[model samples]
Target: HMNTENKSQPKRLHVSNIPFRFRDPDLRQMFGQFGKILDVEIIFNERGSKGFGFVTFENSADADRAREKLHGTVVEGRKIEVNNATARVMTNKKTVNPYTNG
Candidate 1:
């Protein structure tokens, strides 16, 4: 059963906003406009509306499209920032001198 469950699900999304007025459902609904919304995540700080959230989609293509469409768009007076779930410390692999020791 667990195998099937994992197969049916999509990748997880990492959101920025820790605590905000918005909830899981709101984030889900917002991203639902683009495609199939798998799940929603809102970080917690013991409060609300930290001004950010994450929405996962079944299709990666749809995710990118949604990011392109939703990014820079105003939501509740705050511009929404949507992107992939990948959180890599070495994002700029080509950076030869990351610390700029000079």
Candidate 2:
């Protein structure tokens, strides 16, 4: 067992469907009311906004409020999705053992 020794998880959130020009400052302005924003990031693909990113808060209490208030909040004509970010999820993976099947 990887000493998954639980240190309190840092406060962070996943935001998606944001506007193309969204940046760190925009995130700060949007989420600052909920709490102190430690950091903000916007994801990009091919130099274009991926329409998603993350926000880091100093504590979970604030993150909780932010998630509740911001989830489905409209921004620039788009309704963005917000949620607490958990461990990385592995997607589209496949595995099989031919010998075991035989």
Task: Give the TM-scores of the predictions, in the order they appear.
Answer: 0.63, 0.70
List ranges where model 2 is wrong by over 4 Å: 1-9, 87-102
> Mind giving the per-residue lDDT tens digits that candidate 1 earns over 1-102?
455444334544554433267788877776678778867766656564455656778877667667777677777677666677753354667548648665
Task: List the candidate 1 regions with Cα displacement exceeding 4 Å.
Answer: 1-19, 87-102
Provide the overall lDDT of each model, using Cα atoms, as 2-decimal numbers. 0.65, 0.79
Residue 84 in candidate 1, Cα distance off native in Å: 1.0
The total of clashing pairs for model 2 equals 0
Across residues 4-37, which tens digit of lDDT does each residue of candidate 2 receive? Answer: 6544445768888888888888877888886688
- What are the C-alpha RMSDs, in order, of all predicted structures? 9.0, 6.3
Clash number for every model?
7, 0
